[PDB]
Every structure is written in structure tokens, then in C-alpha cells.
Design a protein around this ligand. Sequence first.
Ligand SMILES: NC(=O)C1=CN([C@@H]2O[C@H](COP(=O)(O)OP(=O)(O)OC[C@H]3O[C@@H](n4cnc5c(N)ncnc54)[C@H](O)[C@@H]3O)[C@@H](O)[C@H]2O)C=CC1
Ligand SMILES: NC(=O)[C@@H]1C=CCN([C@@H]2O[C@H](COP(=O)(O)OP(=O)(O)OC[C@H]3O[C@@H](n4cnc5c(N)ncnc54)[C@H](O)[C@@H]3O)[C@@H](O)[C@H]2O)C1
Ligand SMILES: NC(=O)[C@@H]1C=CCN([C@@H]2O[C@H](COP(=O)(O)OP(=O)(O)OC[C@H]3O[C@@H](n4cnc5c(N)ncnc54)[C@H](O)[C@@H]3O)[C@@H](O)[C@H]2O)C1
Ligand SMILES: NC(=O)[C@@H]1C=CCN([C@@H]2O[C@H](COP(=O)(O)OP(=O)(O)OC[C@H]3O[C@@H](n4cnc5c(N)ncnc54)[C@H](O)[C@@H]3O)[C@@H](O)[C@H]2O)C1
Ligand SMILES: O=C1N[C@@](c2ccsc2)(c2cccc(O)c2)CC(O)=C1Sc1ccccc1Cl
Ligand SMILES: O=C1N[C@@](c2ccsc2)(c2cccc(O)c2)CC(O)=C1Sc1ccccc1Cl
Ligand SMILES: O=C1N[C@@](c2ccsc2)(c2cccc(O)c2)CC(O)=C1Sc1ccccc1Cl
Ligand SMILES: O=C1N[C@@](c2ccsc2)(c2cccc(O)c2)CC(O)=C1Sc1ccccc1Cl
Lengths: 324, 330, 324, 327
Amino acid sequence: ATLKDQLIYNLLKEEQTPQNKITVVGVGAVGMACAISILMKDLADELALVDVIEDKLKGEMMDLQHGSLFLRTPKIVSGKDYNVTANSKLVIITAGARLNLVQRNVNIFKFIIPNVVKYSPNCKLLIVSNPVDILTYVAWKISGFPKNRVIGSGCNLDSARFRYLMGERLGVHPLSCHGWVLGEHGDSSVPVWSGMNVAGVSLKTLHPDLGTDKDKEQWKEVHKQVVESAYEVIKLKGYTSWAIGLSVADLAESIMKNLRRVHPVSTMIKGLYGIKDDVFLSVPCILGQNGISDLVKVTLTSEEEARLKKSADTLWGIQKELQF
Amino acid sequence: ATLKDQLIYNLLKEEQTPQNKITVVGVGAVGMACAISILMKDLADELALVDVIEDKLKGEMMDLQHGSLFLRTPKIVSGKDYNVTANSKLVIITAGARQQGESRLNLVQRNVNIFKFIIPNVVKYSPNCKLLIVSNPVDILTYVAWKISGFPKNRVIGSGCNLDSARFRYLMGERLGVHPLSCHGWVLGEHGDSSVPVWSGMNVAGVSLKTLHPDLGTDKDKEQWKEVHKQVVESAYEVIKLKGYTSWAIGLSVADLAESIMKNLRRVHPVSTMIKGLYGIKDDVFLSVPCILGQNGISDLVKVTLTSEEEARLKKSADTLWGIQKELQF
Amino acid sequence: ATLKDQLIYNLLKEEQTPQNKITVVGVGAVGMACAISILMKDLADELALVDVIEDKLKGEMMDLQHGSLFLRTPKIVSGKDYNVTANSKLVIITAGARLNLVQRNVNIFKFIIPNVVKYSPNCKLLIVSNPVDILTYVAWKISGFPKNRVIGSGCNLDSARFRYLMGERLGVHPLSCHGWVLGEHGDSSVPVWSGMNVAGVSLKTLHPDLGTDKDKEQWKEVHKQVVESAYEVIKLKGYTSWAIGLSVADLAESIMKNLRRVHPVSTMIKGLYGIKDDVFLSVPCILGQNGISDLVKVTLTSEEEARLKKSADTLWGIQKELQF
Amino acid sequence: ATLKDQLIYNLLKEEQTPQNKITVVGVGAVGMACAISILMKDLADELALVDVIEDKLKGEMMDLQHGSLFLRTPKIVSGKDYNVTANSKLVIITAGARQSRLNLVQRNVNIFKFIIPNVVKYSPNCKLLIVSNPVDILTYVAWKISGFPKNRVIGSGCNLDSARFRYLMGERLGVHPLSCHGWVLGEHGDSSVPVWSGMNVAGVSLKTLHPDLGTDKDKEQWKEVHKQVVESAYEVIKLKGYTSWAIGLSVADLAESIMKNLRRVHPVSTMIKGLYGIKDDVFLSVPCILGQNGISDLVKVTLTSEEEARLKKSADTLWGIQKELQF
Ligand SMILES: NC(=O)C1=CN([C@@H]2O[C@H](COP(=O)(O)OP(=O)(O)OC[C@H]3O[C@@H](n4cnc5c(N)ncnc54)[C@H](O)[C@@H]3O)[C@@H](O)[C@H]2O)C=CC1
Ligand SMILES: NC(=O)[C@@H]1C=CCN([C@@H]2O[C@H](COP(=O)(O)OP(=O)(O)OC[C@H]3O[C@@H](n4cnc5c(N)ncnc54)[C@H](O)[C@@H]3O)[C@@H](O)[C@H]2O)C1
Ligand SMILES: NC(=O)[C@@H]1C=CCN([C@@H]2O[C@H](COP(=O)(O)OP(=O)(O)OC[C@H]3O[C@@H](n4cnc5c(N)ncnc54)[C@H](O)[C@@H]3O)[C@@H](O)[C@H]2O)C1
Ligand SMILES: NC(=O)[C@@H]1C=CCN([C@@H]2O[C@H](COP(=O)(O)OP(=O)(O)OC[C@H]3O[C@@H](n4cnc5c(N)ncnc54)[C@H](O)[C@@H]3O)[C@@H](O)[C@H]2O)C1
Ligand SMILES: O=C1N[C@@](c2ccsc2)(c2cccc(O)c2)CC(O)=C1Sc1ccccc1Cl
Ligand SMILES: O=C1N[C@@](c2ccsc2)(c2cccc(O)c2)CC(O)=C1Sc1ccccc1Cl
Ligand SMILES: O=C1N[C@@](c2ccsc2)(c2cccc(O)c2)CC(O)=C1Sc1ccccc1Cl
Ligand SMILES: O=C1N[C@@](c2ccsc2)(c2cccc(O)c2)CC(O)=C1Sc1ccccc1Cl
């Protein structure tokens, strides 16, 4: 007659599978920022963590667990073995180590993806690890999931940084500053000037020289600052964490709560802008409980299409040379 | 005109003084976990960050700012200068660099020295703020914050046993298969190794565990519930061994205190306060008891009936702390 | 091609079922208060409303729908026909008359409960309609559900009001004021004085007269004022809504997110306190994804135990005369 | 000693002036919906309720207070006397009672003549958020009676109109209303203007994709989406007898920008003199930046000639009513 048995009468031991489980793969600075943002948004009833460094993994798990009083996620687990990830709705891959980088990371996915698939055959994959557009393709390929269930973080953070910088210029909350950065994540991303607006007032229409060499106000600087800010953050603190974690949590929210909000994420663009290769790039997608159910067909200028087409060529050039 | 002027007509450019500003001093692992938890709880309309390492400081600020789309804290600032902290309602001190293997005395003297410059700068720019001390040793450093600031007792709060208690309830919830929220239990006194678990208060739904199980908390306990408090101490060392530091649990616990304070909730939390006049304690020491927290900081405290042995452990901590504190120079 | 097909490319069209659906039966003052609170707590991805008054029902649905921009519940439906309630995790019954009260609400349930079960066989039932302890038994009896999946709102509001009044006297937030009102909802509930505490400090130990007539401070009136308050709110306002909505939403949060928090709700207490009859009364219960998995065995004084057994006799006396 | 004093030692006997206080004037269906939504969004540390029906007011206060355990707003107060409203940051006016119009007007002006001065006396530094109808006119009336600068007098205006529109838009497109952008401006209600040029998803102009958007020759008749916005309002009233939830939610959204100084852009009613050839003191909805000082800025929407003419017509009609009011 334990104290537990004296205190509590059990009606059923009928344990059941977690209903809204999320797994993060890789407990580096990016993965843990994703984890804490996810925990604080009450998106999962069970959170699983996986990594190859066993000590760091257990220690992060316990540190999260010790915050359980202040959370609404009743079960947090971790392990190197992927059985802990079983029955995840969403699995978020951040594992890496900050063309060498590709095959290096391709070998890693060859282990991770099949294990993820093994234990959550019907999950959505959200790839954050870089190069994210290539690695989203790699995951799509290895897992054999339909295109809707393999999502890259893509230009989600790029766009968010853009909207912050735009809001600073205008003196307006980023929520009310709209603008899309599409295509290849990072250096070669495309700011779609035609979609930039506040309250439906297109900045292109008011300012027809927007984002061109002529522009007297040099709004191209804003997109340049998006990439410059990324290098400056790494220069200053060594890594990026908070912003990517907050943006991934926002994607997870749409997926887990089947919101059908639209986000700039990396999806297979074969069939658009004259691209015929099996490659992934960022366009606005509708996110929900089976991942990317729909995408928005943004009208690009000839110069913008050309930039996406060049990225798709560069990326297929790397991908045809890959060993699976 | 410029594009901004063509787009937006300005009605006025007046005023602009923060209504719910929080400052965090020290942007290490603890500081930044406090910052992100505070931001995701929509507690502040402005967050200020302060450190001595200028590069790190600026990059941490930027990193938070780039997540602005996903938050409702419209202004994040940072700087080595305390002018960025002006008009803070709450100022959280997580500065000092964590202990290696170094001792308490070495930690004490280095962090006392750090506070001698931090605290007056905080007081200058935010004379009416509540101060929340997290840096270790927390009970001593809360005293130090109080002595230097000249603040009344209600506005100097030490994180104290708030994390100890959170871990205790976590562990208690594990053994019982109940959410920590519904497992009640208080760890009081000196933060860390010497903390006191108050067995008589441990309950679920108002049912005293001690009443059900009289051996609870004793050596004669066949179920060794006394290990639950031991594991609170053990789990802390273990986390530090495994990942090198602690961040998430302390950050979450601190954001909870900040919530009570900023929203004037008058919830009861176990935090360190100036305890002179209780438990036959006569010296100026800060220890954790259950404190009502709100917009004036600690407005009231709960008088917990302690056992002879629990009273003795607190008095012992008070004697030891004061022994250190009398030999400090200001 | 339509504008939609011009703007949006579909990957997959097949309609997925809701992951976290809740139904509210009865769109009166209580039902809609439950709904708004549930909606502002982000507990459901689908909300279904049912009533017999078709106009009021449609209008209430539309009114919620028109607030969709400010919510995170992407689908809101209504109907007199229970097919709109299909696949609910949780079904909350607030339909009824605001002995005669019993028989006529029993006749309503003979139609409601089978229809609920038909379309959501694995749902948790949460009963709010009065008299709640009797009607919870009625719902259990008719549904054929196991007892863990039939939950009466019970003493959850009574305890919430008790903690509010306690907080006012002590000048402490009700969250930090702990105290349990158990047994039969309403006039015959039992305040468990031994459990009343702040920070683990027993009020009864500090103030032995607590809950007796000898008490100079009349702490016994705190429990009486719980009952007086209910009647007073009705006199002043005509009904109660907000408090009960909020309390139901809190129960729903533990159920839907599997929190395993303890709440005072109505459950089958046969086998406890000498009770032999098939009756439902409030004890502290652990709430999660399977409804009530466990029960806290509160130590009650001789008088408290007898008060509970008395209620059980009274409730069975009524129950045995009912026609199903 | 008392139980409280044996349990609790007091360090200071309080009490600060209220720091994040909101008052709601009028505890009808709309005001109580505003109240619950504000409470569930943790926007205030003190909520004050005012009305002229004593019993109802006291009963609503108690009902809310009884849910305190589940809220984070530690002080909820009410009264017919406006001393209970002292030091509010934001005062929300939903007083009047449900419906001619000029009847509703001069009737509600008589009400405002008592309400507004009382509000001003106890919170001279508050922002006013007017919800009561006709909202554009009644926002003008609160502005004039108060003597407040125009930045602190905000009308709910076309906020609800724009949210209904976005709901309808999202229903058509199979997208969440958050990702469906579109603005309904001008006079709240029957005469509101859908700005077809701003209507977009992901910055893709639906007008650019479909130049017939919002026109008569539109083969998909997207004009009906605006008509449905107005038809929706009549339908709700017919079906349930009043509107509450949606307006409450939208108002709470405005309160959040204001109390948290977010500087988000919302379609609210503001003094529009000097724009679109409007020369009178009239309040019409345009996109406004909302923060701790109310409306600090407004967005200059480029309107078609027909859009501008509709705003001008509302302005003339509104001014013609306003000029005749007795204060
Ligand atoms: N798409 C975007 O917007 C962003 C992408 N990223 C990417 O996130 C990735 C990680 O970033 P950091 O956390 O800063 O690196 P990190 O070095 O701090 O952490 C990486 C983690 O991956 C783990 N790991 C390595 N191999 C593994 C394996 N086979 N299985 C499981 N875990 C394994 C490591 O143990 C380590 O904990 C990088 O690829 C980085 O480029 C970074 C931020 C922005
Ligand atoms: N009370 C509790 O339960 C706590 C649980 C965890 C940690 N607690 C303490 O937080 C502090 C800080 O922990 P952390 O892990 O964040 O230390 P770091 O070394 O990583 O970071 C410290 C920062 O402190 C900064 N620092 C250092 N000096 C200064 C000055 N003079 N002003 C401002 N900031 C300063 C320094 O640059 C670092 O950025 C340490 O005393 C821990 O024992 C206490
Ligand atoms: N358990 C608690 O703590 C409670 C606190 C407050 C209310 N409690 C009870 O909720 C119910 C409902 O109270 P409410 O104030 O909401 O009554 P209303 O009259 O406003 O609404 C009842 C609705 O119930 C509808 N109704 C009536 N019959 C039906 C059927 N057969 N199916 C569906 N809906 C039905 C009817 O049309 C109304 O719309 C009643 O038994 C109250 O005693 C008890
Ligand atoms: N702007 C929008 O989009 C709105 C959409 C919905 C409704 N909107 C208006 O809110 C108000 C109130 O609507 P509601 O439906 O709540 O009317 P009620 O009759 O139920 O409530 C009115 C309350 O107003 C009170 N009242 C009446 N007079 C007073 C005075 N003088 N002081 C304080 N309170 C007063 C009265 O006693 C009632 O309690 C009305 O003008 C509606 O057209 C506007
Ligand atoms: O923000 C980051 N930091 C990384 C980076 C920064 C500059 S180039 C790559 C990065 C690099 C190394 C380590 C690390 O943790 C992150 C990884 C990454 O993809 C990003 S987002 C980014 C990067 C470049 C341009 C624009 C953007 Cl929006
Ligand atoms: O959890 C922690 N980690 C620290 C620690 C852990 C064991 S002893 C001190 C710590 C130590 C060293 C570096 C560092 O960053 C933190 C600092 C600290 O106070 C705590 S909380 C703690 C510590 C000991 C016993 C019980 C508790 Cl609830
Ligand atoms: O608070 C209420 N109001 C009702 C009531 C009130 C007095 S007796 C029954 C009620 C009555 C009529 C309409 C309605 O919506 C609710 C229904 C009900 O159960 C409650 S809770 C209650 C009722 C009596 C004593 C104690 C409590 Cl905690
Ligand atoms: O939604 C409502 N209901 C009211 C209404 C409806 C049709 S005309 C006025 C209304 C009317 C009567 C009573 C009442 O409580 C509300 C009050 C009101 O302003 C609105 S919003 C509205 C009204 C007309 C067209 C478009 C909109 Cl977005």
C-alpha cells in the first residue's frame, strides 16, 4: 500500500499514444530555441528530442522538464534511439554542425530520415538544417513521402527579418508590414517588390522605382540588410537561435492547429517559372494538418523568374551529383 | 516627399515613455532564457538588455529583434550604458558569470564587486523599479542589492527557492502521475544545497501526504520520499555536468515571478526576502518564505508553521549567511 | 480558370478529419459562454454547436464565425442534426431548463445522448445541465460509456467561487488560495475545511474554530456565500454565464491537452464513503485525454462522509423512479 | 488576532493608482462581450464596468469575479458612479441600447452628454474607444464633448466590417482570414467601401490577377462579398436579435494594440478632415496606427475616383446630421 495507492484510486491504466506529438532532431542552439518556443506556445502534448551527443541531450531534456510547472506539455522525452520519437505528427530536423557541407550532411540524413520514417511513418517533416532547400529535397527523396509532407523552413526567417527591417523604416509593427522574400534561402533570395504593402497600399504603385538601381531611397538596401544582418549576428554572438526558433514555432502552429495560414516555405517548384528539375524553393504555401496542401502562384517579373530559374539550375547541378 | 511620408500621415510625434518596461542585466544563458520567456508571455512593452560584452550583447538583441513578427513586445533595446534601462518597472539581475571549480567566497566577492557598479546605475535610471535578483549566491546577493540600492524591503526580491520548489513539484508529479500544478509543496530557506522541504505542506487536493504517511520526510520512510528533496539538489548538479549550465527552467520560473509582479496578481511564490523578525532570526538576512507578489514587489508574506528541525535549518542558514555578510565592505 | 485556381495551386484536395474537435450542445447563456472561452483558449481545431432553436443557433454560429480573424479555430459549424458533431473529442451538454426539472431534462437526454454517441463514439462527455449530478448519471446510463468518459461539471464552479471568496478575505489571488467543495453540486455541497490552505499552511490547524458556529470570524459563511452568490447572481442578472463558461473551458483544457490536473468534478463514487448506489458526486479527479483516469481519495471527517452518503441516498431515491 | 493576521505578515498597506486599467461603459451584449474578450487576453490589471441599470451591472460584475481563478485580471469593479473608472488608460463606450437613426443619434447624444464629461473628469488622460451606433457620428460627438485631441478619440468604425469581409474572403479561398488581406473603409455599416485594389493574399493583388474584381461585369461577382458583409449584419440580428461575439473580439484586438503600444494598423474611425476633398469635421475609417497614444498616424490609401466619391458622400450626409445636433 504505497502512498500513491493511499492517495489515488486508479480507474484505468489504459495508456494511449500521444495525440499531438512533436519531435526535434538536434539539440543545438537552433533546435533548443525551436523547442522552447514550441513549449511556450502550447503546441504539443509530448515533446521528443534526439541527438548523437548523449550527455548534452539528457541535460537539455532535464532542464526543460524542470520548467514543467510553467508549461502545458505534460511529457518530455529524449534519446539517441528513435523509438522515443514514435507517433510524432511533426518532426523538426535541425541536426548539422553550422558542396563540402552538402554530402557531409547528406550522409547524416541517410541515418536520420529512415529512422524518423520507421517510427512516425505518417508525420510531417520540417527541415531547418542548411542548405535547407537542398536538404529538403534530400529528405523528400530518402523518406519517399508525398511532396506535401516535406517542408523546408526556406525563406520564413528571411521574410520575417525583412518585415522587421521594413517596420523599422516605416515606424509600423512588422505584423502590419507585408512583404515576401522568395526563392532560394539565404544569399540568393528574391525580394518580391510588387507584394510589399501596408494596408493593401502597394509600395511599388506609390514608388514605381522601388527596388531598382534608380530608386532615390534605395529600398534594395532592406533586402541587402536581410543577408547582412545574418552574417552580422553570427559575427557578434557566434550563432543564430532566437529568431529561427520563433519562426519555426509559428510554422508548427499552422501545421498542428490546421490553420491554413500562408507562409514562405520551401516546396518542390517543378512546373513553375519554367523549372523542370526536382528541386525545392520558397513560395507562399498554405500550411495545415497534412503539411503543404496548396501553394500561392505569385506573379513574378521576368527578372524575378530568371533569378529563381538560376537558383533551380545551381541546385540541380549539385543534386544530380549526389549519392543516395 | 519620401516613401514613408507619401504612405503615412503623422498626427503627432509626442511623448513615448514605456509603460511596462523590463530590463535584464547579464545576457548569458540565464539572462537570455529569462528574456525569451518574458517575451513569449507578453509581459513587457519594452525589453532592455545590458552586459559588459558588447559584441554578444548586440547580437543577442538583434536575434530577438528579428523575431519581432512573432512577438508583441514592440521595442527591444540594449547597451553597456544604463540609459537604455530608464523607467523600468522591473529589473532582473543575472549578471556575474557562473561558478566553475570555484567556491562560494570567490563567487561572493567577485559578484559583490560587480553589483557595486550595477545597482547604483539601475537605481539612477529606474528609481521606482522592483529589483529581482537571480545571480548566485542568490540570498547573499539579494541582501547586497538591498544594502546598496537603499530600496524598501518590498522592492528587492531574490529568485531564492522558486526554482528549487518548481523542481520539487516536477519530481513530485512524476512519482504521483499528476501534473506539477496540482502537486503542492514548498521548499524554503536558503537557495540550493541547504534548502528546506516543508513536509507538512505537501499535498494534492488539500490531502496532506504527511497525514496519510506519517514517516514521510524521515529516515524511517520505506518509500524514501526524502529522496525527492535530495534529487532536487542532485538534479541541479547533474544538469550542470551534462550540458554545462542551466537556463530553461530558471528562465521559465523567473518569467512566472515577472508575471505576478507586472500584472499585480498577488499570487504566493517562494522567493527570498528580508526575514529579520521571524524564526528567532535577528540579523539582516534574506531567506525564502512564501511571499505575495504584485506591483509593489513583496507586499506580504505567509507565516509558515515550521517543525523544530525545519526552524533549526533556517536559523543555521541565517547564522551562516550573516557570518559572511558582516565581513563584506560597502 | 477561376480566380481561386489562378491564385492557388492545389497539391491535394482530400478533406482531413478534425484532430481536436469539441461540440457544445445548447446555445443558451451557458453554452455560448463555454464556446467563447473555449475559442479564446485555442483548445479546438473544430467547434460544433447544436440546438433545437434553429434561428438562434444559426445566428450564434455566424456571430462566432465573424470573429474568426481574431481566433485560431479554423472551422465553426452548427446544426439541429448531430452529423455536424461527428468525430468530437469532447462533447459538452448545456441543454436544459434554467423533480420536474429532472424528468423533463431526462426526456431531452433520451434524444440528445444517443445522437451524440452515434456520431462520436469515443468522445468524452462533459455534462453541465442541471441537476448536474443526476443528469451525469443519466448520460452515463444512456450512453453505455465507461465511467471515465462521463464527467459532470459538478463542484468545479462551487470550488472556483469558494476560492474567489477566500481570496477576497485573505487578499490573495484565488490561484494561491486552496480549498475544495465536494459532494453534491449546489445547496448540499460540502466544504472540506481540513484542506483549506495557503502555501501549505492549514487554516484549520491555525484556527480550530474554522467551519463551526463557534467561529468569531464566521469562516463558515464563505461556504454559505458560495450558495447565496449563485442565487444573488440570478436575482440581479437573470442567469449565470461567464463564471461557468470559464470553469468549463479549464476542464476542457486538461482533457484536450492531457494535463492530468486535479479538478473537483462529478464522477461515479460507488465504492467510496460507504456508498453503494450508482450515483455521481464531486471528488478531486485527475483529468486527461481519457477523461477521469484517477480519483483522489480525500480523507473526510465522520460528518463529511455522512453528508456525502446522505446526498447519494437522496439522489438515488430520485434516480430509481426515472423512466429511460 | 484575526486568521488573516496570523497567516500573513504585511510589509505595506498598498496601494498604487491603477496602472493598466480599462473601463467598459454599458454592460449590454456588446459591452459584456468586449469585457470577456479583454479579460481572456490579459490586457488590463483592472477592469471597471459602468451602466445605469444597477441590478444588471452588479450581477455581471459578480459573474465575472466568480471566474477570477481562471483569469489574470485581479481587480474587477463596477458602479453607476464614475469614480470607479478613475485613472483608466482606455475607456470603451458601448452604451445606448440597440436601435430611425437620427432617433438613435439624438437619443444617444443625450446619453453621451452625461457619460463623456464623467469619463473625462476621472480619466482626463484616457483614450476613448467608441463602439455605440451610429459609430462615426457618435465618435465625433465624444470628440467634441470631451475636448480631447483627435488622436485619443477612436471609433470602432470599419474594424468589424473588415473582419467580416476577411472571414468571407477566407471562406471563398480556403485560406485563414489572417492571410486574406482586404480593407473596408469609410462609413461603418451600410455605406462602407471595399477597397478592391488592396485585396490580396501573399501580396498577390487579386485585382491585378482579375481586373474585373469588384466590378459589375465580374463573372465571379466578388462584389457580393461586400454585400454579404452588410447582409451578414442584418441576418445575425434577424436570427439572434443582436450581435456580440464578433464585435467584442474585434474591440479586444484594438485594445491590445493600444494597451501594448503595438503600432499595428487597423481600420478605425478617425477625424478625416483634409483628405479626399473632405472639408468637414467628420470621422471615417481609414487604416490607422494604434499605440499607447491612440491614433498616432494614418495610412494614405490611394482611392479610385468612385471610392473617393463614396467617402465624400458619407462625409456630407454625416456632417448634415452633425450640424443639427444640440450639445
Ligand atoms: N533555414 C534557416 O533559416 C536557418 C538554418 N539553420 C541551420 O540549423 C543547423 C544547426 O544550427 P546550430 O544549432 O546553430 O548548430 P549546432 O552545432 O549548435 O547544433 C547541431 C546539433 O546537431 C547535432 N547532430 C549532428 N549530427 C547529428 C545526427 N547524425 N543525429 C542527430 N543529431 C546530430 C549535434 O549534436 C548538435 O547538437 C545548421 O545547419 C544551420 O545552418 C540555422 C539558422 C537559420
Ligand atoms: N537562483 C537560481 O535558482 C539560479 C539558477 C541558475 C543560475 N543562477 C545564476 O545566474 C548567474 C548567471 O548564470 P549564467 O549561466 O547565465 O552565467 P553566464 O556566465 O553564462 O553569463 C553571465 C553574464 O554576466 C555578464 N556580466 C558579467 N559582468 C557584468 C557586469 N559588471 N554588468 C553586466 N553584466 C555582466 C557576463 O558578461 C555574462 O554575459 C549565475 O550566478 C548563476 O548561478 C541562479
Ligand atoms: N453545473 C453548473 O455549475 C451550472 C451553472 C449554470 C447553469 N447550469 C445549467 O446550465 C443549463 C443551461 O442554462 P442556460 O442559462 O444556458 O439556459 P438557456 O435557457 O439560456 O439555454 C438553454 C438552451 O438549451 C436549448 N435546448 C433545449 N432543449 C434542447 C435540446 N433537446 N437539444 C439541444 N438544445 C436544447 C435551448 O433551446 C436553449 O438554447 C441549465 O440547466 C442550468 O441550470 C448549471
Ligand atoms: N461599431 C460596430 O461595429 C458595432 C456592432 C454591434 C453593435 N454596436 C453598438 O453597440 C451598442 C450596444 O449594443 P447592445 O447590443 O449591447 O445594446 P444593449 O441594449 O444590449 O446594451 C446597452 C447598454 O447600455 C446601457 N446604457 C444605456 N444608457 C446608459 C448610460 N447613460 N450610461 C451607461 N450605460 C447606459 C444599457 O443599460 C444597456 O445595458 C449599440 O449602439 C450597437 O449598435 C456597434
Ligand atoms: O541566420 C543565419 N545564420 C547562418 C548564416 C549566416 C550568414 S550565412 C549563414 C549561420 C551560419 C553559421 C552558423 C549558424 O549558427 C548560422 C545560417 C542561416 O541560413 C541564417 S538565415 C540567412 C543567412 C544568410 C542570408 C540570409 C538569411 Cl535570412
Ligand atoms: O541549477 C542550478 N545550477 C547552478 C548550480 C547547480 C548545482 S550547484 C549550483 C549552476 C552551477 C554552475 C554553473 C551554472 O551556470 C549554474 C546554480 C544554481 O543555483 C542552480 S539551482 C540549485 C542548485 C543546487 C541545489 C538545488 C538547486 Cl534548485
Ligand atoms: O450559479 C448557478 N446558477 C443556477 C442556480 C442559482 C441558484 S440555484 C441554481 C442558475 C439558475 C437559473 C439560471 C442559470 O443560468 C443558473 C444554476 C447553478 O447550478 C449555479 S451554481 C450554484 C447554485 C446554487 C448553489 C451553489 C452554486 Cl455554486
Ligand atoms: O452587426 C451589426 N449589427 C447592428 C446592425 C445590423 C444591421 S444594421 C445595424 C445592430 C442592429 C440592431 C441591434 C444590434 O444589437 C446591432 C449594428 C451594427 O453596426 C452592426 S455591424 C454592420 C451593420 C451593417 C452593415 C455592415 C456591418 Cl459590418
